[PDB]
Amino acid sequence: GLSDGEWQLVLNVWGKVEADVAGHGQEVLIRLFKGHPETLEKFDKFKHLKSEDEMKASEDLKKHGNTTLTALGGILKKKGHHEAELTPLAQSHATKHKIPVKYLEFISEAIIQVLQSKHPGDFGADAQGAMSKALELFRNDMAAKYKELGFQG
Ligand code: HEM
Protein backbone atom coordinates (compact mmCIF):
# COMPACT_ATOMS: atom_id res chain seq x y z
CA GLY A 1 0.00 0.00 0.00
CA LEU A 2 3.40 1.60 0.13
CA SER A 3 5.60 2.15 -2.87
CA ASP A 4 8.11 -0.62 -3.81
CA GLY A 5 10.57 1.94 -2.48
CA GLU A 6 8.86 2.08 0.86
CA TRP A 7 8.59 -1.73 1.10
CA GLN A 8 12.38 -1.72 0.55
CA LEU A 9 13.04 0.77 3.36
CA VAL A 10 10.85 -1.44 5.62
CA LEU A 11 12.65 -4.70 4.66
CA ASN A 12 16.02 -2.99 4.98
CA VAL A 13 15.32 -1.86 8.57
CA TRP A 14 13.67 -5.14 9.30
CA GLY A 15 17.00 -6.93 8.49
CA LYS A 16 18.52 -5.31 11.60
CA VAL A 17 15.72 -6.68 13.72
CA GLU A 18 16.55 -10.11 12.21
CA ALA A 19 20.12 -10.04 13.43
CA ASP A 20 18.57 -10.12 17.05
CA VAL A 21 14.85 -10.81 17.23
CA ALA A 22 14.56 -11.89 20.84
CA GLY A 23 16.38 -8.79 22.07
CA HIS A 24 14.27 -6.43 19.92
CA GLY A 25 11.24 -8.42 20.88
CA GLN A 26 11.80 -8.07 24.64
CA GLU A 27 12.41 -4.30 24.50
CA VAL A 28 9.23 -3.87 22.49
CA LEU A 29 7.05 -5.63 25.10
CA ILE A 30 8.88 -3.77 27.88
CA ARG A 31 8.37 -0.40 26.07
CA LEU A 32 4.78 -1.34 25.59
CA PHE A 33 4.30 -2.31 29.28
CA LYS A 34 5.89 0.75 30.74
CA GLY A 35 4.05 2.96 28.25
CA HIS A 36 0.50 1.61 28.56
CA PRO A 37 0.45 -0.45 31.74
CA GLU A 38 -3.09 -1.55 31.02
CA THR A 39 -1.62 -3.71 28.26
CA LEU A 40 0.13 -5.86 30.79
CA GLU A 41 -3.29 -6.92 32.18
CA LYS A 42 -3.93 -8.93 29.01
CA PHE A 43 -0.94 -11.09 29.86
CA ASP A 44 -1.83 -13.58 32.56
CA LYS A 45 1.75 -14.86 32.27
CA PHE A 46 3.32 -11.47 33.00
CA LYS A 47 0.96 -9.73 35.43
CA HIS A 48 3.43 -10.53 38.16
CA LEU A 49 6.14 -8.35 36.63
CA LYS A 50 6.50 -5.54 39.00
CA SER A 51 9.26 -3.59 37.43
CA GLU A 52 11.48 -3.29 34.45
CA ASP A 53 14.34 -5.24 36.09
CA GLU A 54 11.77 -7.93 36.66
CA MET A 55 10.56 -7.63 33.02
CA LYS A 56 14.14 -7.67 31.93
CA ALA A 57 14.97 -10.92 33.78
CA SER A 58 11.90 -12.77 32.59
CA GLU A 59 12.94 -15.53 30.28
CA ASP A 60 9.36 -16.06 29.04
CA LEU A 61 8.69 -12.32 28.25
CA LYS A 62 11.83 -12.57 26.15
CA LYS A 63 10.64 -15.68 24.33
CA HIS A 64 7.23 -14.12 23.79
CA GLY A 65 9.00 -11.08 22.41
CA ASN A 66 10.71 -13.45 19.90
CA THR A 67 7.42 -15.09 19.00
CA THR A 68 5.71 -11.72 18.47
CA LEU A 69 8.38 -10.06 16.21
CA THR A 70 8.80 -13.39 14.39
CA ALA A 71 5.05 -13.35 13.38
CA LEU A 72 5.31 -9.57 12.54
CA GLY A 73 8.45 -10.27 10.39
CA GLY A 74 6.52 -12.98 8.34
CA ILE A 75 3.74 -10.45 7.74
CA LEU A 76 6.04 -7.60 6.72
CA LYS A 77 7.95 -9.79 4.26
CA LYS A 78 4.68 -10.29 2.34
CA LYS A 79 4.75 -6.55 1.59
CA GLY A 80 0.97 -6.17 1.80
CA HIS A 81 0.09 -9.59 0.35
CA HIS A 82 -0.57 -10.88 3.88
CA GLU A 83 -4.21 -11.94 4.43
CA ALA A 84 -3.15 -15.53 5.12
CA GLU A 85 -0.63 -14.67 7.75
CA LEU A 86 -2.93 -11.95 9.15
CA THR A 87 -6.14 -13.96 9.56
CA PRO A 88 -4.83 -16.29 12.16
CA LEU A 89 -3.57 -13.41 14.15
CA ALA A 90 -6.81 -11.51 13.79
CA GLN A 91 -8.66 -14.58 14.95
CA SER A 92 -6.55 -15.30 18.09
CA HIS A 93 -6.20 -11.70 19.30
CA ALA A 94 -9.81 -11.00 18.53
CA THR A 95 -11.53 -14.01 20.13
CA LYS A 96 -9.05 -15.55 22.51
CA HIS A 97 -6.81 -12.65 23.62
CA LYS A 98 -9.42 -9.95 23.53
CA ILE A 99 -7.15 -7.26 22.17
CA PRO A 100 -8.67 -3.92 21.16
CA VAL A 101 -7.37 -2.25 17.98
CA LYS A 102 -6.18 0.63 20.22
CA TYR A 103 -3.48 -1.60 21.72
CA LEU A 104 -2.23 -2.37 18.16
CA GLU A 105 -1.44 1.31 17.92
CA PHE A 106 0.36 1.06 21.22
CA ILE A 107 2.57 -1.83 20.07
CA SER A 108 3.15 -0.06 16.71
CA GLU A 109 4.50 2.86 18.62
CA ALA A 110 6.72 0.70 20.91
CA ILE A 111 8.02 -0.97 17.81
CA ILE A 112 9.02 2.42 16.30
CA GLN A 113 10.39 3.56 19.60
CA VAL A 114 12.65 0.54 19.79
CA LEU A 115 13.97 0.95 16.20
CA GLN A 116 14.59 4.62 16.84
CA SER A 117 16.46 3.87 20.13
CA LYS A 118 18.42 0.99 18.66
CA HIS A 119 19.22 2.05 15.13
CA PRO A 120 19.24 5.80 14.93
CA GLY A 121 21.93 5.83 12.25
CA ASP A 122 19.73 3.74 10.01
CA PHE A 123 16.27 4.82 11.15
CA GLY A 124 16.12 8.14 9.24
CA ALA A 125 13.08 10.24 8.13
CA ASP A 126 12.53 7.94 5.18
CA ALA A 127 12.78 4.58 7.04
CA GLN A 128 10.54 5.98 9.86
CA GLY A 129 7.94 7.09 7.40
CA ALA A 130 7.89 3.75 5.49
CA MET A 131 7.75 1.68 8.73
CA SER A 132 4.85 3.73 10.05
CA LYS A 133 2.80 3.17 6.91
CA ALA A 134 3.54 -0.52 7.04
CA LEU A 135 2.36 -0.70 10.67
CA GLU A 136 -0.58 1.47 9.84
CA LEU A 137 -1.53 -0.93 7.11
CA PHE A 138 -1.09 -3.95 9.33
CA ARG A 139 -3.43 -2.25 11.84
CA ASN A 140 -6.10 -1.24 9.31
CA ASP A 141 -6.11 -4.85 7.97
CA MET A 142 -6.38 -6.23 11.53
CA ALA A 143 -9.11 -3.66 12.23
CA ALA A 144 -11.06 -4.94 9.17
CA LYS A 145 -10.61 -8.64 9.98
CA TYR A 146 -12.04 -7.84 13.38
CA LYS A 147 -15.07 -6.07 11.96
CA GLU A 148 -15.74 -9.01 9.83
CA LEU A 149 -15.50 -11.43 12.74
CA GLY A 150 -18.07 -9.14 14.31
CA PHE A 151 -15.75 -7.53 16.83
CA GLN A 152 -14.88 -3.85 17.45
CA GLY A 153 -12.74 -1.53 19.62
C1 HEM B 1 2.54 -6.38 16.52
C2 HEM B 1 1.33 -6.97 16.73
C3 HEM B 1 1.23 -8.37 17.39
C4 HEM B 1 1.65 -9.52 16.90
C5 HEM B 1 2.43 -9.79 15.55
C6 HEM B 1 1.37 -10.56 17.88
C7 HEM B 1 1.71 -11.89 17.71
C8 HEM B 1 1.35 -12.84 18.62
C9 HEM B 1 1.73 -14.24 18.50
C10 HEM B 1 2.54 -14.80 17.30
C11 HEM B 1 1.26 -14.90 19.58
C12 HEM B 1 1.33 -16.43 19.85
C13 HEM B 1 0.19 -17.20 19.09
C14 HEM B 1 -1.17 -16.63 19.12
O1 HEM B 1 -2.05 -16.50 20.08
O2 HEM B 1 -1.68 -16.13 18.08
C15 HEM B 1 0.56 -13.91 20.41
C16 HEM B 1 -0.10 -14.13 21.60
C17 HEM B 1 -0.63 -13.20 22.47
N1 HEM B 1 -0.80 -11.87 22.15
FE1 HEM B 1 0.05 -10.95 20.58
N2 HEM B 1 0.69 -9.98 18.93
C18 HEM B 1 0.62 -8.64 18.66
C19 HEM B 1 0.05 -7.68 19.49
C20 HEM B 1 -0.58 -7.93 20.69
C21 HEM B 1 -1.02 -6.93 21.65
C22 HEM B 1 -0.95 -5.40 21.39
C23 HEM B 1 -1.45 -7.59 22.74
C24 HEM B 1 -2.00 -7.12 24.10
C25 HEM B 1 -2.08 -5.83 24.28
C26 HEM B 1 -1.29 -9.00 22.52
C27 HEM B 1 -1.65 -9.95 23.43
C28 HEM B 1 -1.35 -11.28 23.26
C29 HEM B 1 -1.57 -12.27 24.31
C30 HEM B 1 -2.17 -11.91 25.70
C31 HEM B 1 -1.13 -13.43 23.82
C32 HEM B 1 -1.05 -14.79 24.52
C33 HEM B 1 0.30 -15.01 25.15
C34 HEM B 1 0.40 -16.11 26.17
O3 HEM B 1 0.02 -15.87 27.35
O4 HEM B 1 0.89 -17.21 25.86
N3 HEM B 1 -0.73 -9.23 21.24
N4 HEM B 1 0.66 -12.64 19.83
Which properties best describe this structure?
7 helices; 73% helix; Globin-like; mainly alpha; 153 residues; heme; muscle protein; binds protoporphyrin IX containing FE; 0% strand
Q: Quick summary of this structure?
A:
With 153 residues, the chain is an all-alpha fold. Helix content is 73%, strand content 0%. The protein contains seven helices and no strands.
Structure commentary:
The modification Phosphothreonine is found at residue 67. O2 binds at residue 64. Monomeric. Belongs to the globin family. The modification Phosphoserine is found at residue 3. The protein is mainly alpha-helical and 153 residues long. The protein has helices spanning 4-18, 21-35, 52-57, 59-76, 83-96, 101-118, 125-149. The protein has one domain: Globins (Globin-like, Orthogonal Bundle). 73% of the residues lie in helices and 0% in strands. It has 7 helices and no strands. The chain is globular, with a radius of gyration of 15 Å. Residues 39, 42-45, 67-68, 71-72, 89, 92-93, 97, 99, 103-104, 107 line the site of protoporphyrin IX containing FE.
